[PDB]
Amino acid sequence: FSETFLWRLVSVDSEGQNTITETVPDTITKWQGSMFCVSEKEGFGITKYSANFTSFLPFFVELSLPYSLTREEILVMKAFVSNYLEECIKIIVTLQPSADFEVIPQDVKQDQCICSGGRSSYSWNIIASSLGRISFIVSAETTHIGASCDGPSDQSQSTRKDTVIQTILVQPEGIRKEETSSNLVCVEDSNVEMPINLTLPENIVQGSASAFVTFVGDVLGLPLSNLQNLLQMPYGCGEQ
Amino acid sequence: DLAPGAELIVYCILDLELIADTISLDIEKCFQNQVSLSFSDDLGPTASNVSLNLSAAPGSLCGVKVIDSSLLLINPYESLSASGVYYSIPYLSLFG
Amino acid sequence: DDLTYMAQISVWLIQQQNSYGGFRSTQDTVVALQALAFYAQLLFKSNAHHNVFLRSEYGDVGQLNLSEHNRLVVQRLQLPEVSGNYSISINGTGCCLVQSTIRYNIPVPKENSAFYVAADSVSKNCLNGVAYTITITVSVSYRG
Amino acid sequence: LSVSGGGEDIKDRKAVVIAPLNTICLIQMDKPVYKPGCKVRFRLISLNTMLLPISEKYTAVYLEDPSGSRIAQWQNQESVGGVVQLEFPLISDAAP
């Protein structure tokens, strides 16, 4: 969905290359492309400035969302509706609720007329019910009316509405605590076994706990990348 | 073919006597393997199957990276450029 | 049980290595490499031919190799179930430190607590842009 | 040096120095910072003063963390096309 656009390598056929790549429906904002080349005769090559592509719709909704939080805490999701289309038309929104959270509006669910360049917004007061992954799905749709702020509210065609799905994560509520156990087990060319006891207290938040095991050895760590530089002819003052 | 520093000296001879004078000169940080990329065109809708045509040497194998721009704006980019690499090049020339 | 007391502390030292070459001073590196060497000589079995296998009370499964070309790296595994009732088995040779790690989150029954807390700020809404004149105050007490 | 002909020959001697060195190597990333657990994807190249694609042996490459634990390691590689791409799946549960 959205972290990069492209990362690859191709050879050349006497002109370069016209690579064809799909476009992500997550055309959020502009995209920077840079590349490199090498030739066995006249050398290496880079850009002057990166090819900066862009793509979007004149009318849509951008969302303002936070990083992460805990379940019991509330927040206020927000989203601008933005128009670049010339005509001034009334718009409304659709939201998908889910049990992983609770939502309270601000009591103004008003479809509204926005003109060219104009923007409005709406927000939702959200608490959480699940933990971990959280997603929200909404859609901006055009409303039809003839006697509007200015003439009929044009409706374009079937794809007059767009859907957006965006995800963050939510964390456990209280105070976190970690414990560990250790064992240097050294086996002389044989088999050695050990059970593992991991018991936890009672009042812990449900599902909060998570356990994991690590396997290292030591001393063999960095005795090689250290030798090549710790030797030199001593010159200077006597003490140093 | 000329590094950003160029050492030019002009000289001549007068029997037992010589003359010579030199100066270093500034050159742009340019390479030879020209390369040109183009999406055609920009600002469209989510137009998948979009094309990026590029031109370079007729014999070559090489690579490409297209990424976001918000990171570009926010964080101090490592200047991965001919400038930096040529600067990293050692023994470009010697004083004395 | 020198091994017990020693693996973790050697590991701390190793982790706090310096990529510079040497460390902030000399005496530190001197006595360090002294102890590292003596550790190695009371240790350093050359070959570490190794394989390990983790299970649970009812059939957990994990088999990991361990050779020189593998020994330089740390190995890892999350654990799927709730409360740890597992087992480990090893064939071959080698000195390996193994670590078990659990994280959890505890609440307090906030309704009747033995701590009193009160947090507040200088301003509450900025509206000057941000009136940066912002101190944060808190008052706390313990009853029990 | 010595120049000889029917007119006259003159001989002289001075000193020079010769220098065996390596090829500049570098890594191109995709992005500066990532999501935890993902594949860190990058390319390694190296050329000397010729700057023309010349093949060298990628001796050894590895990754280091604040813990100093090597986690992405590849040994004895070579540039098929003057470049080699490596990637590594990060850890989701990562402290910055």
Question: What SS3 string covers D43-80?
Answer: EEEEECCCCCCCCCEEEEEECCCCCCCECCEEEEEECC
State whether residue C76 is helix, strand or coil: strand
* C94/C110 Cα distance (integer angstroms): 50
DSSP bridge partners of A70: A171
- Chains touching chain B at 3 or more Cβ pairs under 8 angstroms? A, D
Among D31, D43, D51, the residue with its CB nearest the CB of B63 is D43
Task: Note whether D21 contacts B90, CB cutoff 8 Å.
Answer: yes
Instruction: Single out the residue of B12, B29, B30, B34 nearest to residue B21, CA to CA.
Output: B12
State whether residue A5 is helix, strand or coil: strand
DSSP bridge partners of C141: C116
CB C79 within 8 A of CB C36: no
CB D1 within 8 A of CB D13: yes
Q: Is the CB of residue A4 less than 8 Å away from at least one CB of chain D?
A: yes
Instruction: Indicate the DSSP class of residue C69.
Output: H
DSSP bridge partners of A64: A78
Q: Under 8 Å CB-to-CB from A192, ≥6 apart: which residues?
A: A185, C89, C90
Q: Is the CB of residue A43 less than 8 Å away from at least one CB of chain D?
A: yes
H or E element, residue A214: strand A210-215
CA distances from residue A176 to A212, B92, D95 in whole angstroms, order as listed: 16, 56, 15
H or E element, residue B86: helix B82-88
Please, which experimental method was used?
cryo-EM
Task: Note whether B61 contacts D24, CB cutoff 8 Å.
Answer: no
Instruction: Single out the residue of D81, C18, B32 nearest to residue A222, CA to CA.
Output: C18
Q: Under 8 Å CB-to-CB from D60, ≥6 apart: which residues?
A: D73, D74, D75, D76
Instruction: Indicate the DSSP class of residue D81.
Output: T
Instruction: Single out the residue of D90, D63, B71, B42 nearest to residue A3, CA to CA.
Output: B71
State whether residue B68 is helix, strand or coil: coil
C142: amino acid identity, one letter: Y
Q: Tell me which residues of chain B, numbers 38 to 77, contact chain D at a CB-CB cutoff of 8 Å.
A: 61-63, 65, 67-68, 71, 75, 77
Angle between helices C27-42 and C2-15 (to 10 degrees): 140
Task: Note whether C73 contacts D67, CB cutoff 8 Å.
Answer: no
Q: Please compute Rg for chain A using Cα positions.
A: 30
CA distances from residue D73 to A220, C70, D91 in whole angstroms, order as listed: 16, 10, 16
State whether residue A167 is helix, strand or coil: strand
Angle among Cα A168, A173, A174 to the nearest 5 degrees reads 150
State whether residue A142 is helix, strand or coil: strand
Q: Under 8 Å CB-to-CB from D94, ≥6 apart: which residues?
A: D36, D37
Angle among Cα C122, C123, C126 to the nearest 5 degrees reads 150
Task: Note whether C72 contacts D70, CB cutoff 8 Å.
Answer: yes
* B39/B37 Cα distance (integer angstroms): 7
A93: amino acid identity, one letter: V
For CA atoms A163, A168, A174, A178, give the dihedral sign.
positive
Count of CB atoms within 10 A of residue D61's CB? 17
Written as six digits, the tokens of B94 are: 């010697």
Q: Under 8 Å CB-to-CB from A76, ≥6 apart: which residues?
A: A123, A124, A125, A126
Written as six digits, the tokens of C29 are: 């590196």
Chain D residue with minimum CA distance to B84: D26
C118: amino acid identity, one letter: A
Written as six digits, the tokens of D3 are: 């120049």
Task: Note whether C17 contacts D71, CB cutoff 8 Å.
Answer: no
* B92/A72 Cα distance (integer angstroms): 63
Q: Under 8 Å CB-to-CB from A8, ≥6 apart: which residues?
A: A19, B63, B64
Instruction: Indicate the DSSP class of residue C110.
Output: G
Report how far apart the first and last C-alpha atoms of chain B are (Å, whole number). Answer: 22
Task: Note whether D73 contacts C15, CB cutoff 8 Å.
Answer: no
Instruction: Single out the residue of D25, D3, D23, D21 nearest to residue D12, CA to CA.
Output: D3
Task: Note whether C96 contacts A217, CB cutoff 8 Å.
Answer: yes
Chain A residue with minimum CA distance to C12: A218
State whether residue A124 is helix, strand or coil: strand
Written as six digits, the tokens of D56 are: 């060298």
Written as six digits, the tokens of A168 are: 């963050």
CB C83 within 8 A of CB A198: yes
Pairing of strands A162-171, A68-70: parallel
CB A90 within 8 A of CB A151: no
H or E element, residue C12: helix C2-15
Q: Strand (E) positions, chain C? A: 50-56, 62-66, 75-78, 84-92, 94-106, 115-121, 136-142
Written as six digits, the tokens of B4 are: 């950003």
* A216/A47 Cα distance (integer angstroms): 44
DSSP bridge partners of A81: A61, A120
* A69/A175 Cα distance (integer angstroms): 13
Closest-CA distance, A208 to chain B, in angstroms, reads: 33
Count of CB atoms within 10 A of residue B44's CB? 15
